Amino acid sequence: MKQYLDLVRTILDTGTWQSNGIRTIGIPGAMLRFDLQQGFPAVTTKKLAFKSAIGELVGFLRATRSAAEFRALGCKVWDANANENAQWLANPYRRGADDLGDVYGVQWRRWPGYKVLDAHADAQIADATSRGFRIVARFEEGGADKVLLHKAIDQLRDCLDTIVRDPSSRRILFHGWNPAVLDEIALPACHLLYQFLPNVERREISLCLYIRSNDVGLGTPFNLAEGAALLTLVGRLTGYSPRWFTYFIGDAHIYENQLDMLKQQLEREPFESPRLELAERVPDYAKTGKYEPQWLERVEPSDFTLVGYRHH
Amino acid sequence: KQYLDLVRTILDTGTWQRTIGIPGAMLRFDLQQGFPLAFKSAIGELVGFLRATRSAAEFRALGCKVWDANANENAQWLANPYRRGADDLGDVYGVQWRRWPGYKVLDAHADAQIADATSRGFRIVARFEEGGADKVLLHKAIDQLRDCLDTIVRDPSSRRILFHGWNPAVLDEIALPACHLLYQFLPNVERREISLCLYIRSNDVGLGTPFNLAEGAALLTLVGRLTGYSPRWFTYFIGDAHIYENQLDMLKQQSPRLELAERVPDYAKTGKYEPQWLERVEPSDFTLVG
Prior knowledge:
Chain A: GO terms for molecular function: thymidylate synthase activity. By secondary structure, the first copy, chain A, is α+β, with helices and mostly antiparallel strands.
């Protein structure tokens, strides 16, 4: 995690000050890159809220849009956004208490995809239905008969399928930035795009994660934990050992009211990284040869544990 | 230098499959210091994307031949029922950047949602019954890029100024899915500097990288001109970074200035917002001197 502390130092030494209530100091474009075989990228100069981060990831895997369900998973980080944020409270897409809208995992697992086809475009219709689209309406437009097709697209499960079927593919990615629904949600995706990169020779799998915006103090440690944990779960279910986790940040910044806290962290002696264990009950595809992607839903926060986590 | 270090790293630590590659790389360039047939082809591609082009012929007229084979020789695409005919590519890249087909299915009596959607440019295009409920289908052709330019001028402290070309609903309707995928602009209002982060899912570090760098730098230069900001950082994030075996000879062996024509007006000098220059700009407006 030296790279993390070095990022903080770089922002403080080379960043510029900006207003937005609380000022931030930031740089555009940074990378952290971790070899997960060397350890899990937990901050040690403070306590990582590991169970909260794992709870959040499990929530996303389950396409959760309720802060109550996040809370049941050990994660309170959505409560204010769901229930106090004035702009969200005024948003007509908010269903009521604890609702977040179709954030993050809803887009990962259930992206609402539509096609509008000519009603007699038989080959297009057959192709779309073969891929899981279904006809939900027939209507006239411009004096032409149309069909609306819909699919709740499970990008993440599609990625796991491609890893097992076609690991040399350079298209194994999902993301949560759906322009059609930016106006319907509590918060737009901060951690945005996830790309998996299997290595057949080495039986290794890597992850590149694009982050639109991070509070480097409070957010980066949480998102590191979640991305590393996701890669570990995906490797378990697809027969690959997790290897490189590359974390790409667009707007990397630090809030002015965190400076004192962060400065004290920069002075502390970091500890060796811990190791992440994913519970034996989550079956290993490399051992079983049984493909069981339902474990994306069946995994619980308690299946993720850190071994040897030392921290200040 | 950064570029050659990436090359060295791939060659020394990559895995063969022929191509040799690593996962996750970054190049980061200060465009104020300098620019990072090839150039004109890249510019022609960019102008084609800006104009939401789906025809290889239109790309060729703009000086770009790189789409012909994918339009007309790729067996999978030739068999695809969404292909209209010769030179068609489907709604690739710029069509998503400029005219992303955004849909909502709302309850017909969700007045406040429907009103909100209409205020944002959605229109009701169909009414139908599903699951015993009366529903309305709303549609907007979302111009993500224009929305970005508007936000740069209106609210530059926004950290949401980005567009991309990866629309999961149409991956089955297109000649190739977006490779240079996500573009994020980062205005710094205190310094009137604008930066760009670009995520590329797959890149030939030999011939692909120079091409994509030209297009990204050109786009940041155009956007800065039209929004009142000087280009600064261009950060280039790569997922699958690889080199072809057939290029090793060439790579084993191995700045100019970008100019955008003065006829493309500078918002910082005119005070007149003219985002229509995204369509009016021509390949000839971009030159690479030195």
